[PDB]
Amino acid sequence: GEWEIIDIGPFTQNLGKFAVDEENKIGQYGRLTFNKVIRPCMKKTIYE
Amino acid sequence: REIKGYEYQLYVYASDKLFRADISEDYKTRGRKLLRFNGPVPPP
Numbered sequence: 001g002e003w004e005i006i007d008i009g010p011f012t013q014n015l016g017k018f019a020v021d022e023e024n025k026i027g028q029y030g031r032l033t034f035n036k037v038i039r040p041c042m043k044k045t046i047y048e
Numbered sequence: 049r050e051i052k053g054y055e056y057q058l059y060v061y062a063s064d065k066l067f068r069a070d071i072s073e074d075y076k077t078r079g080r081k082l083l084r085f086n087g088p089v090p091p092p
Contacts, residue, residue, distance in 0.1 A: 001049075006056075012056075012058070015056050015058060015071055015080075016058055016060040016069070018071065018080055018082070019058060019060055019067075019069035019071055019082055019085060020060065020062045020069075022082035022085070023062070023067075023069070023082065023085045026082075026085070028085070029062075029063075029065075029067070029085070029087070030063075031063075032062035032063045032065075033062060033063050034060070034061075034062050035060075035061035035062055035063070035064065036060070036061055037058050037059065037060050037061075038059050038060075038061065038092070039059075039092070040059070040092060041056065041057070041058050041059070042056070042057040043054055043055070043056055043057075044054060044055040044056075044057070045051055045054055046051065046052045046053045046054060046055060046072075046075075047049035047050050047051060047052060048049060048050070048052055
């Protein structure tokens with residue numbers, strides 16, 4: 001709980017794909033081609 | 049308590065460069081938003 005380390009399976013990889021797709025719309029880093037997500041990946045749980 | 053949602057902190061390689069990306073995700077809908085995207089960062 002709150003903060004936890006998660007795996008880097010398809011779900012996490014797709015989170016990475018989403019991040020790159022969003023960043024590509026912004027253009028701050030030019031055209032990026034998603035390669036992969038590596039460890040570690042952290043997941044924070046937000047309450048209220 | 050709630051869970052409003054989650055925040056994912058990732059290390060993502062794009063164009064062979066390493067970036068750190070933070071993503072928010074609503075608990076119910078899974079609605080996602082890119083919060084931060086910075087790099088290149090040194091490897092973990």
